[PDB]
Amino acid sequence: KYSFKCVNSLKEDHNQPLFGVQFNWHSKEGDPLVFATVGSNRVTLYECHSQGEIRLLQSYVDADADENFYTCAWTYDSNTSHPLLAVAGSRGIIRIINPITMQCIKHYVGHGNAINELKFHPRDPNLLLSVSKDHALRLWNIQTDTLVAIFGGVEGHRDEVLSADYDLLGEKIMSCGMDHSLKLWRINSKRMMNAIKESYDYRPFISQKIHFPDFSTRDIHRNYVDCVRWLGDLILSKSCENAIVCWKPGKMEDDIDKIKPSESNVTILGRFDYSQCDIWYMRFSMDFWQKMLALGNQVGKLYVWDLEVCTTLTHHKCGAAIRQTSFSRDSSILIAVCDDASIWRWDRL
């Protein structure tokens, strides 16, 4: 159904892998389409214009030449509507950047190691989720500069957490990582709702230590799980086994909100099969309305599936691993970022 044309490409002069890309979905209709890229010690902003034009806006260069940004995520200031960009990577430092000036507003130290992904709560712009090499997830309230909770410990992940996602209403998180597991952490529990409210009321702040998840499975994939997203009440997750698996906790007819923490079953609903994406750390993405699913492979091919029912986007110059993709909010534009620092723009026909 969906068709795209490659209208432009460029290469960042640092020539290092680009691991993250995100359009700013908070921009109002009528405002310019903006996306950020992250790789090496760099954070770069670009604006999309007519006739495939990619306009460089500003570049953030970390004073630490050894920093390697892995992820970025957009939010806004709850009081002034001002756009904000969070970035993190190998150093395990979260930096809140002002995207209009490209200067860092503040930074958070805490994670014992590298941060693999950042996500903002879909309803509360102040709630930032970080997943780390230290086997834990952390929830921060960036308005009061407090660590709300740490998800890890006794029954937490046993190796690096690679990805996590909030569901559409921000009531729960699914995380995944190097231990091959996918774990559910409910944040609409009376305990978590109160811990969030308390973070707004803030002796130093006492963070919740959540050692036990609400569901756990190691029965979906047989290797590192590097990307997870909610698709309604269902889950989309992938490993390096050349498939995105669509699955759900419990038996076929089990309600996600009735799943007990000891639930032993999983139900597979289907698989999105592809090829040459058998290396670790390759993200898939969806558009805002979750009508499209995109994933790049290790040789520069871009797969796009229609979620309401597969298109393969290739260019002879795009041969490097596509680490992540991002759709514009209206889904008219798809950007792919690569291991060789190249950026590819695909416009919907």
């Binding site: 700013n24 979905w25 908070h26 921009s27 109002k28 405002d31 310019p32 903006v34 902003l45 604006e47 806006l57 806004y76 002034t80 509507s81 001002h82 756009p83 995207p99 209009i100 879909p122 309803r123 559409l168 209403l169 698709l231 309604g232 009440d233 269902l234 805002f288 309305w289 979750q290 309401e308």
Partner: peptide, 26 residues
């Protein structure tokens, strides 16, 4: 599918919250 109906209604709620917002351009 019933899950698609859940997606539609929940994304519509988020889009309405986005439509009520006027975030400053980058």
């Amino acid at each position: 599918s019933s899950n698609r109906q859940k997606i539609l209604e929940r994304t519509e709620i988020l889009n309405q919250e986005w439509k009520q917002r006027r975030i400053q351009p980058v």
